[PDB]
Design a protein around this ligand. Structure first.
Ligand SMILES: *C(=O)[C@@H](NC(=O)/C(=N\OC(C)(C)C(=O)O)c1csc(N)n1)[C@H](C)NS(=O)(=O)O
Length: 499
């Protein structure tokens, strides 16, 4: 190299409405030529003190690099801080105009946006995922230096730096601040270890919000534990439990063998399958209709329906909605989980599959699956970027079966003995709670609203609640309520629970 790199301007990242999320800010990097510094030793303590370096340790560094023509002194100073060191007129001290990322929303979109390294290269999240679009191409400038390495002049701009391109994400910052605030509050209120909240636009496949606890400030790195950096909604796999019962119910209704008014005997609240024992949470029931199986969240009831229709029909619905399937988002470190398949399904595996014990999914996958159901059984491909021209979508559940299932889920929320904490002020909502044993628990709520013209699907995951309450309908459902209520207002969704 007789040339020095011209860092290009990194692409602006914004939310869906142009709110900046990642801003390339001008910084100044100082470098020095030790062969020039070696003839100006009486200036070193002044230069050391301006750099925040120890006098002797700085002098040692120069003396050791004496034959080298380039050393970095300090990186990423404000243009003002850098201009101050240049003003000392220390022979052989030079500056390079660089760029450093600033994240205006900080810890609020840390996991989605990600961050760049010291070299301004995308290391996590969107920054990495879209690195090629955002980076552009670094320029080149030919220099003239005497034999001592002293930079005389810039000969030419060999290759002009081409700046990065802007990126508008699908994230609505208002919804993102709202989900972030409320998930933080739920974590603190319950003494919970971690959590995730995902908001989906059921019509466009857009991820409107994706927040996780714990989080970190991407602007102030240093000391950061791995727990805080984990983009949980995409990288944490979990058993979805009772939240998959709507999909087992879709298979039952699509079979031709079941209707909502159908009865299933669940007495005495247990069912033995060889050495394994299926157990219901509440065990004071005998005959339950299909809606009552979802309200009471009966594992016995769903297991018996699964035996009637066969696991192959259930697996097919769960596979089609995307449970344990690749999202198609080339998102760094995103997990696929697992949807177990069998050549021939045994009795025990049929039952555990129908109630979500036999499977691992992400909160993104669960939200996408509820979006398909909410969107009249049609699955629109997921997007982390703003969707202007919406792709076609795949019909994964018949519209009639999807409509019936939506109605039962509105009853789960609105009916006697139902998930009353998930109710949305002034709207009809629909959803299903889940509680998974990890005793350590995972508290879930999945749902959508308005129930009469769905617009939003949402998943709330609260990992390890440490207070008396651990059930999803008690821990996660009130989060869904507050966030959904706020999001429908922000999106000008007309209330459908009109007096
Ligand atoms: C569905 O989420 C249903 N969950 C279960 O039956 C599971 N365990 O239940 C509890 C937490 C009571 C237990 O300690 O046994 C379960 C499913 S997958 C898994 N790994 N554990 C709960 C009962 N329904 S909800 O609607 O009340 O949340």
């Amino acid at each position: 190299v007789r040339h020095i790199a011209i860092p290009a301007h990194r692409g602006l990242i914004t939310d869906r409405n142009g709110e900046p999320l990642a801003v390339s800010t001008p910084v100044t990097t100082l470098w020095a030529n030790p062969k020039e510094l070696m003839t100006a030793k009486e200036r070193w303590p002044q230069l050391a003190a301006a750099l925040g370096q120890d006098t002797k340790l700085f002098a040692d560094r120069i003396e050791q690099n004496a034959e080298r023509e380039f050393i970095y002194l300090v990186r990423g100073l404000t243009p003002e801080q850098g201009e101050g060191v240049i003003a000392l007129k220390v022979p052989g001290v030079y500056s390079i105009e660089e760029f450093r990322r600033f994240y205006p929303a900080g810890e609020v979109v840390a996991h989605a946006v990600g961050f760049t390294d010291v070299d301004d290269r995308g290391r996590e999240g969107i920054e990495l995922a879209f690195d090629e679009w955002l980076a552009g191409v670094p320029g080149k400038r030919q220099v003239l230096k005497d034999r001592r390495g002293r930079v005389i002049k810039d000969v030419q701009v060999t290759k002009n730096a081409k700046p990065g391109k802007t990126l508008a994400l699908s994230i609505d910052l208002r919804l993102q601040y709202l989900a972030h605030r409320e998930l933080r509050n739920a974590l603190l209120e319950n003494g919970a270890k971690a959590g995730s909240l995902v908001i989906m636009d059921v019509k466009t496949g857009e991820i409107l919000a994706m927040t996780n606890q714990p989080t970190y400030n991407p602007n102030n790195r240093r000391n950061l534990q791995p727990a805080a950096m984990r983009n949980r909604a995409m990288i944490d796999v979990f058993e979805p439990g009772s939240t998959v019962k709507p999909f087992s119910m879709s298979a039952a209704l699509a079979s031709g063998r079941w209707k909502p008014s159908d009865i299933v005997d669940v007495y005495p609240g247990t069912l033995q399958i060889g050495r394994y024992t299926i157990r219901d949470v509440s065990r004071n029931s005998r005959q339950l209709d299909l809606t009552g199986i979802l309200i009471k969240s009966s594992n016995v009831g769903i297991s018996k329906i699964a035996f009637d229709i066969g696991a192959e029909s259930i697996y097919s619905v769960m596979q089609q909605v995307g449970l344990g399937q690749d999202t198609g988002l080339g998102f760094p470190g995103e997990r696929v989980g697992n949807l177990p398949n069998h050549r021939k399904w045994p009795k025990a595996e049929t039952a555990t599959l129908a109630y979500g014990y036999g499977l691992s999914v992400t909160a993104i996958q669960l939200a996408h699956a509820y979006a398909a159901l909410a969107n009249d059984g049609k699955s629109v491909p997921l997007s982390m970027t703003r969707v202007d021209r919406v792709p076609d979508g795949v019909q994964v559940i018949s519209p009639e079966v999807a409509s019936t299932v939506q109605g039962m889920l509105q009853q789960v929320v609105e009916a006697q003995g139902g998930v009353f904490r998930a109710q949305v002020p002034g709207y009809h909502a629909a959803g299903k709670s889940g509680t998974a044993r990890k005793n350590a628990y995972r508290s879930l709520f999945a749902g959508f609203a308005p129930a009469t013209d769905p617009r939003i699907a949402m998943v709330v995951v609260i990992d390890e609640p440490s207070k008396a309450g651990y059930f999803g309908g008690l821990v996660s459902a009130p989060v869904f309520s507050k966030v959904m209520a706020g999001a429908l207002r922000l999106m000008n969704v007309p209330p459908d629970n009109l007096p």
